[PDB]
């Protein structure tokens, strides 16, 4: 790990410089030397604030919401310094962190970063209130390149079907919790009871990770199959019969 720290009380121009410095280092280490790298950036909103600072210094008229009008070009320059290239083997993968200004999804910063990035991950406050150490949400998240990031040549063939089936199951289970909120359990079927079981056990076991627990991808697939096993083979509509024949027993 190569680490960089910039304090909140430091000069702002240092804040402007620092992420570019780190990206240069990652670039060199990943292209001049054959190595994959994973760059993480934290609190890019502070970088936006420093960009506003330098813009104010140079006497430029603010655009939307006071942010500089050339924020978009800058954020383009910071990003897209990653991927794979011809004739090489190294790679870069970029994971910044954004802070939401009071859940404004139309705020320029998150909006632009969404327009320039592929997919997104959310953090849900209600889960944090529920004391789940990873507060990562499931329903609104999405990965653009999942279809090719996995496959037979990767960890395991089953994974796409498992993910689709459990996605549908989790969504429907949330809807069933919404039902039981009003209708009452007395008018409930056995299948919906199994769905509720799936929801509660999912929350209790799968999503919870722990600050010092490690799980290889094979273990995650196995736990997912443990969750899937609760339903009969027929209720798993999304999965082709083949995968069920190999794995469900």
């Amino acid at each position: 790990v190569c680490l960089f720290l910039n304090l909140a009380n430091d000069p702002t121009i240092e804040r402007i410089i620092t992420p570019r410095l780190a990206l240069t280092t990652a670039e060199f280490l990943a292209y001049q030397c054959e190595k994959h790298v994973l760059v993480i950036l934290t609190d890019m909103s502070s970088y936006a604030e420093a960009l506003r600072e330098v813009s104010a210094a140079r006497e430029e008229v603010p655009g939307r919401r006071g942010f500089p009008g050339y924020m978009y070009t800058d954020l383009a320059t910071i990003y897209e310094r990653a991927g794979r290239v011809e004739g090489r083997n190294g790679s870069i993968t970029q994971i910044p962190i954004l802070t939401m200004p009071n859940d404004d999804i139309t705020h320029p910063i998150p909006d632009l970063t969404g327009y320039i990035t592929e997919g997104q991950i959310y953090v849900d406050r209600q889960l944090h209130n529920r004391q789940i150490y990873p507060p990562i949400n499931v329903l609104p998240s999405l990965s653009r390149l999942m279809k090719s990031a996995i496959g037979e040549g990767m960890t395991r063939k089953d994974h796409a079907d498992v993910s689709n089936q459990l996605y549908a199951c989790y969504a429907i289970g949330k809807d069933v919790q919404a039902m039981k909120a009003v209708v009452g359990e007395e008018a409930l079927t056995s299948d919906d009871l199994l769905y509720l079981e799936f929801l509660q056990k999912f929350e209790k076991n799968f999503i919870t990770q722990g600050p010092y627990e490690n799980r290889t991808v094979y273990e995650t697939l196995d736990i997912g199959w443990q969750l899937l096993r609760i339903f009969p083979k027929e209720m798993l509509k999304r999965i082709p019969q083949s995968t069920l024949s190999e794995f469900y027993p």
Partner: protein, 50 residues
Amino acid sequence: NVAGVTLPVFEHYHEGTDSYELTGLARGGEQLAKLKRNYAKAVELLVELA
């Protein structure tokens, strides 16, 4: 309470009071008990339908 609404519903309770056995008229009790069953089943089904 099939739902959030409250639903009226009835049950066929049997108090058990003594019925009026009739036997004076040529001792027809054999037909009368047959009737006591035929109409009683009907009454049960009425209560259900109501």
